[PDB]
Amino acid sequence: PGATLCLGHHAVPNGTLVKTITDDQIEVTNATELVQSSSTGKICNNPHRILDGIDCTLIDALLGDPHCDVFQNETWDLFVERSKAFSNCYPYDVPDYASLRSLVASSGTLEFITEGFTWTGVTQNGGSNACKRGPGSGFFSRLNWLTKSGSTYPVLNVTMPNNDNFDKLYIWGVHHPSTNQEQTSLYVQASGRVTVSTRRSQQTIIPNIGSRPWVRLSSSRISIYWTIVKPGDVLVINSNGNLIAPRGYFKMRTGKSSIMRSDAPIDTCISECITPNGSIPNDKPFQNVNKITYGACPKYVKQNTLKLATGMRNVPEKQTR
């Protein structure tokens, strides 16, 4: 009579199924989830500077729609646009809206520097009841609606050189009246024109007379354009009517700033990764919450679960029942 010595390994009562090269489901002792599939529903206010747009799109804050005046000179890592946002100034369009929104979002600032443009022989600071500011008529804070002085609108020809060491972003526009009566009444000339140029580029916009749909008291429109002026270059603005003039320029930065559409409330917490659904943890390498992300995020994948085996094959003793 001697002895027996058996070698073996553990097992557990409750194993997990995982995928392998040879098996689509096979049981191991433990595994861990590699796909983040949940969010708190809330955007953490740290560590990124979150700016809630509230009632305002970035573009309306840029232009200076009065109910968006609170955004003057603001900065952000992430600007959050809400589905409840509305415009409440003169009706307008932006050809290439998406690009202007992108470049401003990326710049991360609305810092505005006023410049003393000289508009000889026109009336400045035009307003409208479409864009109330306090009790009276008003306008976009960063734009200067020019109309005739007396019975003339001369050829406007002005310059603003950039002798700084940073880029200037100028926002300007063109007024499209609904009737010929309106055109001549405001600008004298029967057809206006706006030419904005630098050494290397130029934009010429001819206004267009005609009704558009009635929006906030007006069938007319303003179209918004932009021009970047680099150090050593010069802005020239030439117009015989319909110019919506800049009051200055926006400072441009480069950096980590962006914009996101989300209705998630902002809360006091810390999360590197932000989605429109809210912040998510980033301990896992993959996520199924949203393909739209900002920050240090798991990579978006289609699977809602992927299990990484963290133990051996789980082999229970063959059972009698």
């Binding site: 073996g8 390498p285 900002y294």
Partner: protein, 172 residues
Amino acid sequence: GLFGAIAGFIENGWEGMIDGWYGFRHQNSEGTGQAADLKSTQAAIDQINGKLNRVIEKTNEKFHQIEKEFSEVEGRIQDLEKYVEDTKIDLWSYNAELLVALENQHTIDLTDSEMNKLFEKTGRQLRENAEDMGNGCFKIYHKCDNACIESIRNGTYDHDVYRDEALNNRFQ
């Protein structure tokens, strides 16, 4: 798995072994008992911790990107923006699927391997004083009191001590 120990020549695991991943069960003159092997247990765990930390290594931080949802139909440019994102997501989804498949196959093979490594090491300790029954158990051909069993488990078992005793019992 590739080594054929776990779910192979070892019929099943031990739910009873709660202090380790691999180990020993014995029967001798003094009764029966169980003990975990720490080295093999730790080798498996260290290798699994290693791959876990490699996999969960944070490696991408992205800020301004392209838009991925659209409120207006636009055509060509939007088709491309969508296709770019859909292409990316599919490639990442594939990487993720392949990664877990490879990782998990390997995890099963390495755990199977570690079982086998402990078994071969034990077989080598016992030299000619035992025989492989073929089910993970050695029949030892001599008196092996708890001191002797623990000597095998903690690596101090001298086979020359019991060789004459054992060789006789084997061939007689």
